[PDB]
Amino acid sequence: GEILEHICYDVNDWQMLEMLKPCVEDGFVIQDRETALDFIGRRGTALGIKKEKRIQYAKDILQKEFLPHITQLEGFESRKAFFLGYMINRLLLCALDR
């Protein structure tokens, strides 16, 4: 629900929720932060251990590589989530032709 709220601001517009339903359906498999970080780190393996000094590497990549301009600190990582939600909202609006 928090992800949907971040993606879609006005709950009245049900079209966005209908279009995003497959997204949440496929993402329902993941429910833990550690699992998400491990899955992100699965690709681009460089002879490393996902559970050993790779979760921190993925976290650092997310802190820096993902939206570096908005911030470069781990104190407040919610800004990246809000920016991603805004980006997805714009993409959905463009797709809907509005």
Partner: protein
């Protein structure tokens, strides 16, 4: 279906088979004969099975099962 192995330390000796109908990932090496089985999802990939096998091996070695 080519990945490294830990027991025999041989590169590209590992093959992973993903049965999505049964949702089972089986990893087998063609040299040392080691076989491992795990639960997988529709979005699973052979890298996921390899990571699960490595984690299981680490847990067994540590003896913290």
């Amino acid at each position: 279906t080519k990945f490294n192995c830990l027991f025999c330390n041989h590169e590209k000796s590992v093959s992973c088979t993903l049965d999505k109908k049964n949702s089972i990932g089986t990893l087998s090496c063609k040299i040392c004969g080691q076989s491992f089985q795990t639960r997988i999802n529709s979005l699973s990939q052979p890298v996921d099975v390899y990571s699960d096998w490595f984690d299981a091996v680490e847990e067994v070695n540590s003896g913290r099962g």
